[PDB]
Structure 1
Amino acid sequence: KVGRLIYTAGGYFRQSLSYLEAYNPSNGSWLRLADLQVPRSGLAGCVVGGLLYAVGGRNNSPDGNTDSSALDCYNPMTNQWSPCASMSVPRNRIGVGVIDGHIYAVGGSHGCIHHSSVERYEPERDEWHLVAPMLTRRIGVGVAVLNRLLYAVGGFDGTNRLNSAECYYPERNEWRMITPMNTIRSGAGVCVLHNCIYAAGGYDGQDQLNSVERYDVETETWTFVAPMRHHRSALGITVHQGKIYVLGGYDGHTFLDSVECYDPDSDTWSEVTRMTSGRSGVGVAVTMEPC
C-alpha cells in the first residue's frame, strides 16, 4: 500500500495543458513528471497494471480546438509516455472506468456531437471495441465502478444538464437507469468510496456547486454529505486510503489550485495541499511513485 501518488494529467488554464504532476499525501510534496505528448483538457485518467492512462479530451490552443480520440500510457518506471490504440471517435469531456483490467470510455463530445456511445479497451491486445451505448447522450459525465458495475452520472445531453444516472451490467451488455441525483450536475467529480458512488461539485446550469451527494448501490438513494469548502466544476477526483481527493476546477471566478480531502468517518472536508497552478479539466488517478 505504501509509495502511491495522486497523479494529475493535463487540464486547462487559458489553453489546454500538458502537465503531469504527482502529489505524495505522505509528505506533501509535488513532482513534475514527463509532459503529455499532446496538451489536453477534459480528459480522464485511470490506472491498469500500474500504468497510468490518459483518455480522450481536447487540445484547446490559440491555433485551434482538436477533440482527442487518444489513449496514451505513462509508465512510472521509465517516466515516459507511449501511445496506445486510439478510440473509435474523439471524446472530449469523457468519463472513464475500469472493470477487471479493461478501460471503458463513456460519452463525451466531438464538436457539436454529444455521444451516447461507449467502448472498451483491452490492454493485453491493445484494442478497443464498442459496447452497448448509454440510454442518454452525456458529455461532462462522471463515471465510476463499484462491484464490477459501471455508473454514468449526470452530464449534458446537448440541450439539458442532467440529474439522471445509469448503470452498465457487463454480462448483459445493457444499461439501465438508476435513481436520479437530487441535483443537476455537469462536470462533477464522480468516484466510489465504500458502498457508494459520490458526485461532488459540477455545474447545475446556473452555478458551480459545492454540494456532494452519494448513491448507495444497495438502497438506491442519493444522500447529501458535507459540502466542499469551494464550489467547483470541471474538478479532478480520486480516492486514496479511504478518502476522496478533489483537485482544482473552476469556481465561477478562479481556476482553483486547492485540493480538498473528504473523510467519510467524520463527514468533513479539509484543504490538504495546493496544485502548482490553478487549472480545471484534469485527469486524475493513483499509482506507484516513479523511477
Structure 2
Amino acid sequence: GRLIYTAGGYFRQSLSYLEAYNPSDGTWLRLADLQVPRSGLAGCVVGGLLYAVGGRNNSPDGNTDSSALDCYNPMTNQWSPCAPMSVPRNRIGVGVIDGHIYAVGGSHGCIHHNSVERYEPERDEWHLVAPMLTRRIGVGVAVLNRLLYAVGGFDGTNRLNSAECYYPERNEWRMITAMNTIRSGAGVCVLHNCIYAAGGYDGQDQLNSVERYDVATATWTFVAPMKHRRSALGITVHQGRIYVLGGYDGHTFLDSVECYDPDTDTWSEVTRMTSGRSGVGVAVT
C-alpha cells in the first residue's frame, strides 16, 4: 500500500506537519515534523525516500527563504538534511527524471528565478542545468516522456499561461503550446500521458478550472472543474486518480481534499486534512 504524504504548508505561519493519508482506509498518520517549518516547498519521492525541497519559513517575527533539501525515511520516521541548493527557492516546482531531482524556478526575496538545478542522491550534490526561457515562481512541474515541463507561474510582472519543455539529453528548453488560462500557483501533474493543470491564480481570482495537455495533438483542453477554487494547492496521482489537497481560495486556507476520476470526468471530496493549509509539498510512496 502507498500513502499520500503532505509536508509543510501555511496557516497563519509556515508549518512543520508531515502527515500521510491512506486512500484505502481513509486514515491520516501524524509523522515526524520537519526540522524547519516551510511553505511554498515541493515534495517528491526517490528510492522510497521523501524529499522536501525549498520553500520559505514565514513566522510572525521574520521570513526566511529556504535553499534546503531534507530527506524523510518512512522506515525510520526521521528527517535528515541533504546538500542545499545554490540559491533559496520559495514557490518552487520539482520534477524527477531517472532518480534525479530538478528544482525549477522559485523566488528569493526580490528575485524571480529562471535557473534550474539537478540533485544527484547517489553523490549528494546539486548542479545547475540550462535555465528556463522565462523566470517562473509558483511554477507547476511535470515529467512526461522523460522531458521536464514548466507550466505557468509568475515572472515578476505578469502571471503566465505559457509553458516550456526541458530536454535533459540536449540540455535545452523549448516553448510549448500555452494554456487557455493564466495560472500561477496551480497543481500540475501527469496522468495517463497527459499533463493536468488544476486551479491556481490568474491575477484576479483563484481558479477552480482544470485543463490537460495532449502531447499528440499539442492542445490544452478543459476537463471538469474542481468543487473549490484554490491556489497554492498540493497535487499528486494515486492509482489512476488525481488528488488535490488544500490551498487558498482568497480568504480561507482549505482542508478539502478532492479526487478526479478520469474515466467519469468527475471530482469528489474524499477526505479533509487535519487542518486547513496552503503551499504544501505532496508525494506518494
Q: Using the alignment, how far apart are the partners of 1:146 and 1:74 within structure 2? A: 25
Q: Using the alignment, how far apart are the partners of 1:252 and 1:17 within structure 2? A: 19
Q: Using the alignment, how far apart are the partners of 1:237 and 1:206 within structure 2? A: 22
Residues 58-92 of structure 1 deviation map (CA, whole Å, 9 limit, x = unaligned): 00001211000000000000000000000000000
Task: Give 3-state SS (helix, strand or coil) of 2:28's partner.
Answer: strand
Return 5+ residue gaps in structure 1 as ranges.
none
TM-score (norm 2): 1.00
Corresponding pairs, count: 285
Structure 1 runs of 4+ off > 3 angstroms?
A: none
Q: Using the alignment, how far apart are the partners of 2:273 and 2:145 within structure 1? A: 32
The residue number in structure 2 matching 1:148 is: 146
Task: Give 3-state SS (helix, strand or coil) of 2:173's partner.
Answer: strand
Residues 124-164 of structure 1 deviation map (CA, whole Å, 9 limit, x = unaligned): 00000000000000000000101111000000000000000
Q: State whether structure 2 residue 127 is matched by structure 1 residue 121.
A: no
Q: Using the alignment, how far apart are the partners of 1:223 and 1:171 within structure 2? A: 29
The residue number in structure 2 matching 1:221 is: 219
TM-score (norm 1): 0.98
The Cα of 1:268 is off from its aligned counterpart by 0.3
Task: Give 3-state SS (helix, strand or coil) of 1:4's partner.
Answer: coil
Give the RMSD, CA atoms, in angstroms: 0.4
Q: Using the alignment, how far apart are the partners of 1:21 and 1:281 within structure 2? A: 14
Q: Using the alignment, how far apart are the partners of 2:175 and 2:159 within structure 1? A: 16
The Cα of 1:9 is off from its aligned counterpart by 0.1
The Cα of 1:253 is off from its aligned counterpart by 2.1
Residues 79-118 of structure 1 deviation map (CA, whole Å, 9 limit, x = unaligned): 0000000000000000000000000000000001000000
Task: Give 3-state SS (helix, strand or coil) of 1:237's partner.
Answer: strand
Q: Identity rate of aligned residues, in percent?
A: 96
The residue number in structure 1 matching 2:46 is: 48
Q: State whether structure 2 residue 268 is matched by structure 1 residue 282.
A: no
Residues 233-289 of structure 1 deviation map (CA, whole Å, 9 limit, x = unaligned): 0000000000000000011121100000000000000000000000000000001xx
The Cα of 1:218 is off from its aligned counterpart by 1.7
Task: Give 3-state SS (helix, strand or coil) of 1:16's partner.
Answer: coil
Return 5+ residue gaps in structure 2 as ranges.
none
Residues 31-75 of structure 1 deviation map (CA, whole Å, 9 limit, x = unaligned): 100000000000000000000000000000012110000000000
Q: State whether structure 2 residue 255 is matched by structure 1 residue 272.
A: no
Q: Using the alignment, how far apart are the partners of 1:179 and 1:132 within structure 2? A: 20
The Cα of 1:219 is off from its aligned counterpart by 1.1
Q: Using the alignment, how far apart are the partners of 1:160 and 1:89 within structure 2? A: 23
Q: Using the alignment, how far apart are the partners of 1:71 and 1:4 within structure 2? A: 23
